[PDB]
Amino acid sequence: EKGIYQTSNFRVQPTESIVRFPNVTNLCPFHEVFNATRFASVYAWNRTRINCVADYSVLYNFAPFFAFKCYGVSPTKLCFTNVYADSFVIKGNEVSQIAPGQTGNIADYNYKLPDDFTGCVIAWNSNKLDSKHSGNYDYWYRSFRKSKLKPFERDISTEIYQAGNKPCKGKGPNCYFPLQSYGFRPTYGVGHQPYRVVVLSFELLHAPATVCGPKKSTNLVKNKCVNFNFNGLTGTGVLTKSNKKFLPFQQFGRDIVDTTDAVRDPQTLEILDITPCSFGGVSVITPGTNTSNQVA
Amino acid sequence: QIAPGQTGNIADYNYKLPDDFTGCVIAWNSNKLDSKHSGNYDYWYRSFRKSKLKPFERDISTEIYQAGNKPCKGKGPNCYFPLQSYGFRPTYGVGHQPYR
Amino acid sequence: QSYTNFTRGVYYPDKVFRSSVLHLTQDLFLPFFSNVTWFAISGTNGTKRFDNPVLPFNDGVYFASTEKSNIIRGWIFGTTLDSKTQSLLIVNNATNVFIKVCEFQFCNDPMESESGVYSSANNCTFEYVSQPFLMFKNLREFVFKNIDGYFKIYSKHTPIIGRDFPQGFSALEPLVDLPIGINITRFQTLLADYYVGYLQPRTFLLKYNENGTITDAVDCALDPLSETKCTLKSFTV
Amino acid sequence: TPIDFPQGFSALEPLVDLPIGINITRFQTLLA
Amino acid sequence: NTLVKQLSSKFGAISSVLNDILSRLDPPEAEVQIDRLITGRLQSLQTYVT
Numbered sequence: 001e002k003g004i005y006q007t008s009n010f011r012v013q014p015t016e017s018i019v020r021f022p023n024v025t026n027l028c029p030f031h032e033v034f035n036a037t038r039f040a041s042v043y044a045w046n047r048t049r050i051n052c053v054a055d056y057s058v059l060y061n062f063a064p065f066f067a068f069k070c071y072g073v074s075p076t077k078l079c080f081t082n083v084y085a086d087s088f089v090i091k092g093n094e095v096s097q098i099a100p101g102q103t104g105n106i107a108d109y110n111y112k113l114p115d116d117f118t119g120c121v122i123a124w125n126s127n128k129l130d131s132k133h134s135g136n137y138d139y140w141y142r143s144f145r146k147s148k149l150k151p152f153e154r155d156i157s158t159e160i161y162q163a164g165n166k167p168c169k170g171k172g173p174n175c176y177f178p179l180q181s182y183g184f185r186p187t188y189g190v191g192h193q194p195y196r197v198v199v200l201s202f203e204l205l206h207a208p209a210t211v212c213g214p215k216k217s218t219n220l221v222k223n224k225c226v227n228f229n230f231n232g233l234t235g236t237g238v239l240t241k242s243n244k245k246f247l248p249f250q251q252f253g254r255d256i257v258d259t260t261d262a263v264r265d266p267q268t269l270e271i272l273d274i275t276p277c278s279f280g281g282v283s284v285i286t287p288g289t290n291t292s293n294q295v296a
Numbered sequence: 297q298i299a300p301g302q303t304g305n306i307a308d309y310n311y312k313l314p315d316d317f318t319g320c321v322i323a324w325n326s327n328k329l330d331s332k333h334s335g336n337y338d339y340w341y342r343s344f345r346k347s348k349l350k351p352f353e354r355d356i357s358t359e360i361y362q363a364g365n366k367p368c369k370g371k372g373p374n375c376y377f378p379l380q381s382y383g384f385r386p387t388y389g390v391g392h393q394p395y396r
Numbered sequence: 397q398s399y400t401n402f403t404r405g406v407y408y409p410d411k412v413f414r415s416s417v418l419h420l421t422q423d424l425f426l427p428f429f430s431n432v433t434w435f436a437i438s439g440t441n442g443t444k445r446f447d448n449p450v451l452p453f454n455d456g457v458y459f460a461s462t463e464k465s466n467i468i469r470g471w472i473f474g475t476t477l478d479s480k481t482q483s484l485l486i487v488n489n490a491t492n493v494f495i496k497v498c499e500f501q502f503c504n505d506p507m508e509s510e511s512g513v514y515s516s517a518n519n520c521t522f523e524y525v526s527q528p529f530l531m532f533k534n535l536r537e538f539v540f541k542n543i544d545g546y547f548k549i550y551s552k553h554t555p556i557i558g559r560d561f562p563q564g565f566s567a568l569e570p571l572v573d574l575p576i577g578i579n580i581t582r583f584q585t586l587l588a589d590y591y592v593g594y595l596q597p598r599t600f601l602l603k604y605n606e607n608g609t610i611t612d613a614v615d616c617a618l619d620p621l622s623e624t625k626c627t628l629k630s631f632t633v
Numbered sequence: 634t635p636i637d638f639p640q641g642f643s644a645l646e647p648l649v650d651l652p653i654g655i656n657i658t659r660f661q662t663l664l665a
Numbered sequence: 666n667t668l669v670k671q672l673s674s675k676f677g678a679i680s681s682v683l684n685d686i687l688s689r690l691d692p693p694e695a696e697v698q699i700d701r702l703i704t705g706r707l708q709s710l711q712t713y714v715t
């Protein structure tokens with residue numbers, strides 16, 4: 001019928017999305033573990049913690065990993081609140097045995113892995129460092145131990161398998177010494193050749209929730225209707241230069257009705273006002289369909 | 297993971313239910329039939345995929361997925377076979393035993 | 397001892413900028429005119445070289461001092477404080493503010509010729525350094541709160557004219573917020589004239605300026621006029 | 634529609650529901 | 666002003682921001698929390714209109 005009718009509301013949509021996070025600090029000491037003069041032993045394990053700012057693309061680029069399997073999503077860099085990194089150099093016959101619920105001679109007598117842990121086991125060819133076949137000191141694990149170990153049993157406490165026809169204290173006749181050349185001597189250079197193996201549990205969830213993957217930041221866009229995410233504070237709006245004087249510790253501001261109206265740029269510290277993108281009602285004016293189909 | 301709204305390597309890359317799902321998910325411990333002493337490697341799981349799975353889609357491609365900044369043919373340092381077999385054995389714990 | 401007439405300790409409850417508004421909020425604050433213990437007892441030599449009292453940490457505490465000598469050097473927060481449990485140690489220096497959280501059996505101080513030797517530490521997990529870089533008479537107010545696994549330290553340093561607690565309102569700006577994750581039930585003051593109060597859940601009406609500072613505050617349950625002010629959300633009734 | 638286009642209104646009925654489960658981004662028309 | 670302030674109310678939800686609910690929770694739990702926020706906001710609109 002003739003008249004003015006209220007129809008669906010209109011919005012001005014954003015054309016692009018921007019994500020802003022502060023300058024990325026120094027990274028977790030993953031480079032020192034992998035790009036090492038000498039690799040660490042099972043007892044000389046590290047505990048990456050807290051400007052860790054984990055970033056796992058550096059390991060994908062640094063070395064040619066050949067047996068890298070992640071129980072959690074191998075691509076996701078996400079959180080953990082701890083990273084319990086562990087290292088060792090092992091023969092390329094037992095690398096497949098560094099896994100939950102597996103046994104063999106290794107793990108039972110070396111580094112048992114529990115069920116239900118993010119076992120992101122990594123491994124690559126170590127022949128370049130163990131090129132001499134005599135035997136290398138830097139990364140000895142435990143080839144044999146008197147009794148089966150519990151998951152995450154202490155690596156710092158080492159021993160010699162007490163095998164024999166009489167009680168053995170560690171070293172002795174028919175006892176198995178962990179420092180025999182073993183894996184470190186490459187010999188063939190395939191198969192049995194020592195493989196540099198790194199395993200990070202990533203399994204400690206606790207109250208701090210600190211270490212997590214690097215947060216990407218896009219360029220800043222102003223004077224346009226955009227979507228935004230500023231340090232986890234998200235929304236839709238138009239960002240403009242602010243005349244507000246924020247205190248050194250304030251990150252965003254609010255109106256009298258507790259809505260967001262300003263942000264602090266994480267990288268430049270410029271104060272930006274957030275204007276909502278235009279919207280309003282839409283009214284359709286018609287003579288009525290019994291006279292004419294022209295509308296306004 | 298075989299439930300609406302769940303995440304994980306199967307829910308995301310092998311078999312996914314819609315969030316609006318009506319039906320029944322029945323599971324049984326098959327360790328005595330599927331697990332071989334030496335390991336049953338006939339069952340494969342997808343772990344590397346470019347995109348997440350959409351509801352009831354069955355993608356059986358085995359093309360090599362490269363996680364690095366340089367593609368390659370065949371196996372490579374950042375070039376992985378998309379499927380990982382799992383060797384079920386009678387000695388694995390309940391969490392790692394096969395289920396039908 | 398048993399000092400009262402204090403009306404100070406309001407701090408910015410969050411990091412949100414507000415301009416010419418009155419904000420009503422419920423948080424842990426030092427109540428106005430609450431009982432604050434004046435520490436005589438441990439002044440000057442006090443019981444130093446013989447003993448050192450340990451105070452409870454109930455939800456959070458207010459600390460203030462006017463000693464220009466910088467005899468006050470730090471705090472230890474935790475439970476057992478004998479290496480059985482993890483504890484937090486904060487020590488100030490001329491140009492280095494150092495926070496370490498780990499198990500400790502003891503520290504350095506159980507005339508004032510030597511300090512900074514310490515004793516031992518083990519299995520240490522968290523360290524943080526120099527948030528403010530530093531830390532003629534000044535009043536140095538601090539608030540120490542431990543909630544949801546985060547240890548929040550607020551502070552303000554203001555000049556004085558030689559008077560004990562010059563009057564006027566000054567809110568404490570946040571200094572540092574660390575994800576420590578430990579249980580804090582007791583703390584102790586380390587010396588090489590300080591006041592300690594306790595925070596309680598309260599509702600306050602905070603007056604924000606045009607430039608985002610807090611210029612006044614009302615303790616909503618102090619008296620019936622303050623309660624009326626919070627009902628109307630106004631400093632004028 | 635057994636009656637150029639007269640522009641008369643008509644509507645389609647469901648015919649078949651096939652659980653193919655595939656991406657189906659592209660297609661071709663097959664002619665004899 | 667009251668109606669706008671109601672957007673900050675949780676109505677029992679873990680958060681008042683829909684994007685936070687969607688980001689941290691799986692669809693099922695997010696749907697429960699969002700449905701709760703929808704109920705609270707509809708109640709606020711009914712109060713305003715009445």
Ligand SMILES: *[C@@H]1O[C@H](CO)[C@@H](O[C@@H]2O[C@H](CO)[C@@H](O)[C@H](O)[C@H]2NC(C)=O)[C@H](O)[C@H]1NC(C)=O
Binds near residue numbers: 023267268
């Ligand atoms: C880290 O933040 C600083 C600012 O605190 C950035 O430095 C500015 O960079 C712009 C160019 O993008 C220059 O025009 C400014 O003069 C710089 N200011 C200062 C104080 O350096 C810096 O680019 C950010 N990123 C890194 C990696 O440092």
Ligand SMILES: *[C@@H]1O[C@H](CO)[C@@H](O[C@@H]2O[C@H](CO)[C@@H](O)[C@H](O)[C@H]2NC(C)=O)[C@H](O)[C@H]1NC(C)=O
Binds near residue numbers: 347656658
């Ligand atoms: C269905 O096919 C399309 C086309 O191949 C897929 O879209 C591609 O997705 C990948 C994922 O990283 C992109 O890199 C490609 O650029 C996309 N193709 C384009 C834009 O033409 C789509 O992902 C497929 N669906 C599923 C569920 O895998």
Ligand SMILES: *[C@@H]1O[C@H](CO)[C@@H](O)[C@H](O)[C@H]1NC(C)=O
Binds near residue numbers: 245605606607
């Ligand atoms: C805010 O800062 C400006 C800086 O020029 C100053 O002129 C103004 O007086 C300040 N306002 C208040 C209330 O302090």
